[PDB]
Amino acid sequence: ELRVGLEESELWLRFKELTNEMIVTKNGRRMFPVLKVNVSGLDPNAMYSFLLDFVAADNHRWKYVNGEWVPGGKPEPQAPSCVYIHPDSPNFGAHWMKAPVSFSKVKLTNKLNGGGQIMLNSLHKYEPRIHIVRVGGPQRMITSHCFPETQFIAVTAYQNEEITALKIKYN
Numbered sequence: 001e002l003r004v005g006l007e008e009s010e011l012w013l014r015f016k017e018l019t020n021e022m023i024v025t026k027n028g029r030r031m032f033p034v035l036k037v038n039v040s041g042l043d044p045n046a047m048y049s050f051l052l053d054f055v056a057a058d059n060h061r062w063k064y065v066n067g068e069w070v071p072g073g074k075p076e077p078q079a080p081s082c083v084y085i086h087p088d089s090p091n092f093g094a095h096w097m098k099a100p101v102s103f104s105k106v107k108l109t110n111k112l113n114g115g116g117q118i119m120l121n122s123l124h125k126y127e128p129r130i131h132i133v134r135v136g137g138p139q140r141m142i143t144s145h146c147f148p149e150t151q152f153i154a155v156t157a158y159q160n161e162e163i164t165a166l167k168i169k170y171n
């Protein structure tokens with residue numbers, strides 16, 4: 001069976017217990033922590049492209065009110081995010097399974113922009129998601145996996161200083 005697991009879940013859970021925040025910039029900001037995924041059960045000889053996207057976890061705008069994150073009252077539908085293709089794609093199963101697949105080069109922005117960077121809505125909550133796409137073969141297949149542990153709110157600057165501190169302590 002194709003098995004997908006989160007590397008360094010320990011550390012993600014520290015961020016999650018405080019409510020994680022990720023900075024977004026007009027040019028794009030790399031994520032910390034970085035999403036690293038353990039994959040087994042691929043055909044070492046089959047070809048796969050790894051895709052990363054961000055699901056809007058709810059339909060609300062969030063605000064840091066008196067030291068606490070709280071959702072707005074006025075939900076709007078959230079158009080799905082664009083997909084980031086791992087730069088190592090497309091590649092053999094063996095390649096993907098020899099070390100954690102690390103999305104270190106994805107950049108999160110708040111502005112519609114040339115290419116690469118993924119645009120998110122500031123003050124929305126996001127759940128990272130990957131797609132493993134079997135390519136080249138006749139039988140195209142997709143396996144998707146969500147990472148609740150890696151939920152965050154997109155912010156233009158950190159609101160919770162406990163997050164600012166953890167981000168520096170562990171980088």
Ligand SMILES: Cc1ccc(CNC(=O)C2CCC2)cn1
Pocket residue numbers: 049051085086087088089090133135
């Ligand atoms: C950074 C980068 C790497 C590879 C590619 C090639 N396209 C794919 O792999 C498609 C996604 C499913 C097939 C484009 N961009």
